[PDB]
Amino acid sequence: GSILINLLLKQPLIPGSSLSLCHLLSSSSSFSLSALREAQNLAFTGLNLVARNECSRDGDPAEGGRRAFPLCQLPGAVHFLPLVQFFIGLHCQALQDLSVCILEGFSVTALSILQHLVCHSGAVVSLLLSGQGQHPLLKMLLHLLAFSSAATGHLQASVLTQCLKVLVKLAENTSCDFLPRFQCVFQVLPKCLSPETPLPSVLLAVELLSLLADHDQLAPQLCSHSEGCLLLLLYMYITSRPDRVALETQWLQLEQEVVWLLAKLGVQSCQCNVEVVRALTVMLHRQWLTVRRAGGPPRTDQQRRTVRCLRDTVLLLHGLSQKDKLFMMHCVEVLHQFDQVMPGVSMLIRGLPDVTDCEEAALDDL
Amino acid sequence: QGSILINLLLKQPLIPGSSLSLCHLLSSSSESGSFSLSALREAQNLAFTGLNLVARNECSRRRAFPLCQLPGAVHFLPLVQFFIGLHCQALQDLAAAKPEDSVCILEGFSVTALSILQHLVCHSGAVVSLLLSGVGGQHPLLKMLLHLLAFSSAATGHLQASVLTQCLKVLVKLAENTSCDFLPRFQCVFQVLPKCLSPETPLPSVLLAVELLSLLADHDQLAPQLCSHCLLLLLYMYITSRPDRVALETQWLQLEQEVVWLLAKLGVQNCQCNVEVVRALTVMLHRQWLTVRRAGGPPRTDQQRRTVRCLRDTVLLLHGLSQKDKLFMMHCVEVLHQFDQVMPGVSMLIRGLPDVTDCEEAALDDLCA
């Protein structure tokens, strides 16, 4: 709602660099300053415009329809962009050129801004997803994204994360039809998933892979091409940790996201069908090896997330077994782990009081 | 329930020319000894916090006008206090000498801050309280304003002009928005109004200063601190003799009108200055009358209506002066012919109007014999 103002004026947009919106506007040091000042003026104009926001009160009847959880139309926001795209360009203009350490910071800040906007506005979303003639901001992101990932620059750790939070929030706040505009993502998600990437990035890329997998023509963009296939990368990753910080909690977030992805894809309706089960078993044995010893009732939040993941994986595997009856064959390599876990996890879930006919039926099937 | 304070705080045109907005402040860094950068950072965070506060404020308001208290504003204050104490100690030092560009940029910042501060003093009441309430001693922000005013009201600094303009405007508003019980908390300004009123004082600043004298004259204890023996003497020498060679008649007219409203607010309750008031008002009626009459007819201009209104008010005020002093003619002697050439035309005119008042009728009738 109106909270967009509070969000934009959040003192540190990112922890560190102490750069707010103010620290973006008040900078007399692509546009050539023939538009820096004009854009700053648009910025504070839109600040006022939203600080009014007569709209999102007494229900805002126009709020409703598609765009799941209709984002409150904050038209004033539409005026911020030319600034934001000026800076995203000075990042791009500074890129595409075979220092930037400073300019890139303003770009990160502006990306956080755009993130909040896409989060809480609908007119900006209609604009961007509209005109293929993509609103210059979309291209300013995409031509960066490759540079956001391909180059492991010290700051390429963050600009990527923010551009991804933006792309994903924009796929969420919007509707299903426009996603073919997002189509351009698939040329860049692979680099976004390279084992040189950290947990938070692959996470956002998974979330977005899902948000696109809701689209009819988009699911095959998962593994239309059997080779490379924008998968078996996700699985080689989930199995062989390509990150070192690798805070187990983060890896749990990622297992959970990958699981929800697999489930949505399976229910909505590659060579990759084969590796998925191997990776799921590696993951599961990675979980059951943790909680068992602790035993008892999990009072830990991590434990509860793990249990949710395990139950969902069990149901998913039952669906798998429903398919590809060779699943025992492809499982041959790890049947050891599979039968060293399945019985104990069945015991556990039976111990759980939230059991489901699905959980019981599956665990019995195996 | 409105919260327009933020809409006010966010505008680059705050002071035309100076691009410094509230954001050119918050983002202030090492580029620009209690005033260490630590307090800069802390006050900037306080500002952002109070901003988040006011940006959401369901508010429903002896202040004589409820301006819905904006509790969040109170947290915008130490930033202003800091940027003011800077250039306050800076003027203290520029004088202590007996690097000015530092003071220049600094006072630009402080002007921006005084603007933010006047918007607050206007649209909030909790800020009014946090500003007026204090030791007498006094509250540090008010103390800073007053120490500064003297330094800009004195020998002109190229920016002292605007510094003083804004400080006087803030005094005016912090006087209006509050109640009468606290007025005497402003007493300390009677030692320093004169220089805000000196023979070298531009029209806007004096407009503000006399508006302030009239915002103050409600407080009896602060009422006579006119003729002590008399500030009005400077005011009248000014209203009659026109310094500020760069002065649009409209400015002189705003000032004349405010001085008339002042004389009125005083009348509704031993000065060489009180013998001179009449010379001033007579030359003043003559000025307005010679300015308007020749363009006789239905008053179509705005300034025309403004003038004629000033005229009705001045003539009523004169009739008052007469009832006050019988020697009225004795003092008028010096410009008696001005007075007797003006009053008849002013009477013909006042009758020509349809808004005639028994008083403007009686007063204008008694004098014109």
XYZ file of C-alpha atoms in Angstrom, chain A residues 14-364:
351
model
C 21.317 -2.416 1.828
C 23.165 -3.063 5.096
C 26.320 -1.170 4.216
C 27.169 1.773 1.985
C 24.629 3.815 3.981
C 23.173 4.911 0.620
C 19.518 5.951 0.693
C 17.400 7.549 -1.996
C 18.489 10.994 -0.820
C 22.113 9.944 -1.327
C 21.016 9.121 -4.879
C 19.158 12.333 -5.701
C 21.621 14.820 -4.219
C 24.446 13.884 -6.610
C 25.659 16.725 -8.822
C 28.675 14.534 -9.687
C 24.124 8.294 -20.676
C 21.999 11.243 -19.598
C 24.858 13.785 -19.573
C 23.296 15.772 -16.694
C 20.703 17.063 -19.148
C 18.443 14.493 -17.469
C 20.025 13.851 -14.059
C 18.360 16.968 -12.642
C 15.089 16.389 -14.491
C 14.992 12.811 -13.214
C 15.690 13.895 -9.640
C 12.778 16.304 -10.015
C 10.555 13.502 -11.283
C 11.741 11.540 -8.258
C 10.658 14.004 -5.598
C 7.479 14.744 -7.570
C 6.585 11.060 -7.395
C 7.509 11.068 -3.718
C 4.802 13.664 -3.169
C 2.401 11.870 -5.524
C 2.565 8.654 -3.497
C 2.689 10.394 -0.122
C -0.818 11.411 -1.163
C -2.130 8.022 -2.431
C -5.839 8.693 -2.048
C -6.250 5.353 -3.825
C -5.546 2.500 -1.405
C -8.220 3.449 1.118
C -11.772 2.266 1.801
C -11.034 -0.889 -0.174
C -9.844 0.668 -3.446
C -12.526 -1.057 -5.562
C -10.454 -0.992 -8.764
C -8.054 -3.254 -6.859
C -9.058 -6.712 -8.061
C -8.832 -9.258 -10.868
C -5.670 -10.935 -12.100
C -2.213 -10.076 -10.753
C -2.595 -12.409 -7.785
C -2.832 -10.269 -4.692
C -3.553 -7.169 -6.788
C -0.732 -4.722 -6.247
C -2.131 -1.368 -5.198
C -1.853 0.930 -8.213
C 0.712 3.531 -7.162
C 0.881 5.603 -10.365
C 3.254 8.156 -8.850
C 5.904 5.437 -8.830
C 5.907 5.400 -12.647
C 7.840 8.669 -12.482
C 10.843 7.322 -10.549
C 12.166 5.078 -13.316
C 13.927 7.505 -15.722
C 16.271 8.215 -12.821
C 16.634 4.532 -11.968
C 17.269 3.669 -15.604
C 19.758 6.517 -15.921
C 21.758 4.843 -13.162
C 21.189 1.271 -14.356
C 22.645 2.559 -17.613
C 25.676 4.236 -16.092
C 26.119 0.723 -14.754
C 25.480 -0.620 -18.261
C 27.290 2.181 -20.091
C 30.111 1.613 -17.600
C 29.720 -2.038 -18.490
C 29.865 -3.066 -22.156
C 33.272 -1.325 -21.994
C 35.865 -4.112 -21.951
C 35.845 3.932 -11.190
C 32.720 1.823 -11.729
C 33.193 0.724 -8.108
C 31.338 3.909 -7.140
C 28.703 4.141 -9.873
C 27.800 0.485 -9.336
C 26.760 1.332 -5.780
C 24.185 3.865 -6.915
C 22.993 1.157 -9.304
C 22.543 -1.368 -6.490
C 20.583 1.237 -4.539
C 18.362 2.031 -7.525
C 17.781 -1.678 -8.074
C 16.613 -2.024 -4.478
C 14.275 0.891 -5.154
C 12.869 -0.764 -8.269
C 12.491 -3.939 -6.210
C 10.276 -2.205 -3.664
C 8.325 -0.502 -6.455
C 7.604 -3.711 -8.337
C 6.695 -5.185 -4.960
C 3.997 -2.664 -4.068
C 2.833 -1.093 -7.370
C 0.813 -2.238 -10.377
C 1.059 0.543 -12.944
C 4.850 0.335 -13.054
C 4.360 -3.398 -13.608
C 1.894 -2.911 -16.450
C 4.429 -0.506 -17.952
C 7.504 -2.728 -17.690
C 5.747 -5.930 -18.747
C 4.349 -3.787 -21.564
C 6.149 -2.144 -24.463
C 9.187 -6.190 -28.585
C 9.961 -2.693 -27.329
C 10.526 -3.491 -23.661
C 10.495 -0.495 -21.344
C 14.163 0.591 -21.326
C 14.501 -0.588 -17.717
C 13.906 -4.241 -18.608
C 16.669 -4.201 -21.216
C 18.949 -2.237 -18.890
C 18.568 -5.149 -16.481
C 18.900 -7.987 -18.968
C 21.983 -6.673 -20.779
C 23.430 -6.356 -17.279
C 22.368 -9.748 -15.947
C 24.906 -11.617 -18.069
C 27.473 -9.138 -16.774
C 25.886 -9.675 -13.361
C 26.834 -13.359 -13.512
C 29.509 -14.056 -16.140
C 31.903 -11.678 -14.358
C 32.691 -12.681 -10.783
C 33.450 -9.081 -9.888
C 33.613 -8.304 -6.185
C 30.328 -6.415 -6.569
C 28.791 -8.896 -9.019
C 27.861 -10.770 -5.837
C 25.091 -8.260 -5.125
C 23.922 -6.507 -8.304
C 22.869 -9.967 -9.458
C 20.861 -10.750 -6.327
C 19.037 -7.439 -6.635
C 18.254 -7.750 -10.340
C 16.890 -11.200 -9.526
C 14.715 -10.005 -6.650
C 13.411 -7.484 -9.172
C 12.717 -9.922 -12.006
C 11.014 -12.322 -9.595
C 8.866 -9.742 -7.822
C 7.849 -8.505 -11.259
C 6.847 -12.000 -12.349
C 4.902 -12.381 -9.104
C 3.003 -9.087 -8.942
C 2.034 -9.462 -12.606
C -0.244 -11.818 -14.505
C 0.356 -15.022 -16.440
C -0.050 -13.734 -19.992
C 2.855 -11.269 -20.109
C 5.489 -13.823 -19.024
C 6.394 -14.411 -22.709
C 8.012 -11.019 -22.191
C 10.077 -12.680 -19.464
C 11.000 -15.233 -22.136
C 14.353 -13.444 -22.481
C 15.341 -14.824 -19.059
C 16.104 -18.337 -20.292
C 19.119 -17.138 -22.276
C 20.655 -15.969 -18.996
C 19.399 -18.289 -16.236
C 22.176 -20.832 -16.998
C 24.950 -18.357 -16.207
C 22.803 -17.449 -13.197
C 23.054 -21.095 -12.098
C 26.738 -21.739 -12.793
C 28.481 -23.506 -9.880
C 30.395 -20.251 -9.384
C 27.199 -18.693 -8.023
C 26.188 -18.482 -4.347
C 23.143 -19.924 -2.618
C 20.974 -16.763 -2.652
C 21.266 -16.297 -6.409
C 20.435 -19.849 -7.497
C 17.547 -19.535 -5.040
C 16.005 -16.549 -6.798
C 16.639 -18.206 -10.156
C 14.699 -21.245 -8.943
C 11.821 -19.103 -7.703
C 11.734 -17.433 -11.109
C 12.035 -20.702 -13.022
C 8.846 -21.615 -11.170
C 7.041 -18.323 -11.782
C 7.667 -18.966 -15.472
C 6.847 -22.673 -15.249
C 3.302 -21.597 -14.435
C 3.044 -20.532 -18.085
C 1.893 -23.020 -20.713
C 4.450 -22.260 -23.424
C 7.096 -21.753 -20.741
C 7.408 -25.133 -19.020
C 9.448 -26.693 -21.871
C 11.814 -23.739 -21.520
C 12.809 -25.770 -18.479
C 14.234 -28.609 -20.589
C 12.873 -28.240 -24.112
C 16.443 -28.910 -25.248
C 17.556 -32.102 -23.512
C 21.178 -30.928 -23.524
C 22.483 -28.493 -20.781
C 18.798 -28.304 -20.268
C 18.588 -25.643 -17.448
C 18.490 -28.678 -15.126
C 21.067 -31.234 -13.966
C 22.731 -27.915 -13.264
C 20.239 -27.322 -10.491
C 20.760 -30.943 -9.480
C 24.550 -31.044 -9.794
C 24.331 -27.955 -7.591
C 21.915 -29.261 -4.956
C 24.196 -32.296 -4.695
C 27.755 -30.939 -5.005
C 27.954 -27.710 -3.035
C 29.431 -25.057 -5.370
C 29.234 -22.465 -2.555
C 31.479 -22.282 0.498
C 29.642 -20.025 2.952
C 26.906 -22.618 2.424
C 25.006 -21.875 5.602
C 23.040 -25.110 5.931
C 19.918 -23.023 6.517
C 20.407 -21.472 3.081
C 20.786 -24.924 1.552
C 17.504 -25.847 3.215
C 15.778 -22.821 1.721
C 17.124 -23.981 -1.623
C 16.075 -27.617 -1.270
C 12.616 -26.345 -0.307
C 12.378 -24.040 -3.323
C 13.589 -26.748 -5.715
C 11.007 -29.111 -4.242
C 8.105 -26.698 -4.647
C 9.326 -26.137 -8.207
C 9.359 -29.850 -9.002
C 5.871 -30.224 -7.550
C 4.351 -27.326 -9.472
C 5.930 -28.580 -12.687
C 4.647 -32.096 -12.094
C 1.087 -31.028 -11.357
C 0.677 -28.252 -13.943
C 0.339 -30.659 -16.880
C 14.587 -34.319 -20.856
C 17.361 -36.861 -20.234
C 17.306 -34.957 -16.835
C 14.368 -37.053 -15.386
C 17.156 -39.472 -14.472
C 19.488 -37.354 -12.348
C 16.626 -35.779 -10.401
C 16.005 -38.882 -8.283
C 19.716 -39.300 -7.596
C 19.797 -35.715 -6.350
C 16.631 -36.123 -4.290
C 18.110 -39.173 -2.580
C 21.378 -37.361 -1.884
C 19.338 -34.493 -0.441
C 17.072 -36.704 1.647
C 19.952 -38.696 3.119
C 21.383 -35.242 3.788
C 18.271 -34.493 5.856
C 17.456 -37.772 7.613
C 21.099 -37.888 8.684
C 20.497 -34.665 10.620
C 17.217 -34.891 12.498
C 17.301 -38.585 13.442
C 20.082 -38.265 16.016
C 18.361 -35.274 17.617
C 15.164 -37.333 17.675
C 12.203 -36.357 19.817
C 9.942 -33.446 18.930
C 11.632 -30.826 16.736
C 11.409 -27.529 18.594
C 13.933 -26.050 16.159
C 12.634 -24.087 13.182
C 15.349 -25.612 10.998
C 14.025 -29.017 12.061
C 10.493 -28.073 11.018
C 11.613 -26.825 7.610
C 13.560 -30.067 7.186
C 10.487 -32.133 8.065
C 8.320 -30.219 5.604
C 10.957 -30.804 2.929
C 11.116 -34.512 3.748
C 7.348 -35.011 3.573
C 7.124 -33.106 0.293
C 10.033 -35.080 -1.156
C 8.334 -38.329 -0.140
C 5.137 -37.391 -1.955
C 7.182 -36.231 -4.943
C 9.037 -39.545 -5.043
C 5.753 -41.425 -4.908
C 4.687 -39.529 -8.007
C 8.020 -40.381 -9.596
C 7.562 -44.080 -8.846
C 4.142 -43.657 -10.439
C 6.219 -42.673 -13.467
C 9.385 -44.122 -15.002
C 9.012 -47.598 -13.537
C 12.738 -47.949 -14.236
C 13.116 -45.584 -11.249
C 14.498 -48.624 -9.420
C 17.038 -49.005 -12.227
C 18.108 -45.353 -12.182
C 18.137 -45.719 -8.386
C 20.443 -48.771 -8.487
C 23.497 -46.609 -7.778
C 22.038 -45.335 -4.484
C 19.548 -48.032 -3.456
C 21.921 -48.344 -0.499
C 21.097 -44.871 0.825
C 17.497 -45.255 -0.300
C 16.893 -48.338 1.841
C 19.087 -47.028 4.651
C 16.704 -44.058 4.921
C 13.200 -44.987 3.686
C 12.356 -47.208 6.702
C 13.521 -44.736 9.335
C 11.799 -41.816 7.630
C 8.624 -43.895 7.384
C 8.870 -44.591 11.111
C 9.313 -40.861 11.688
C 6.430 -39.602 9.549
C 4.261 -42.242 11.211
C 5.389 -40.670 14.475
C 4.271 -37.296 13.163
C 0.654 -36.372 14.015
C 0.087 -34.283 10.863
C 0.169 -37.402 8.683
C -1.624 -37.490 5.344
C -3.170 -40.370 3.448
C -0.664 -39.353 0.775
C 2.337 -39.579 3.097
C 1.203 -42.929 4.503
C 0.299 -44.368 1.099
C 3.646 -43.335 -0.376
C 5.848 -44.442 2.519
C 4.001 -47.765 2.323
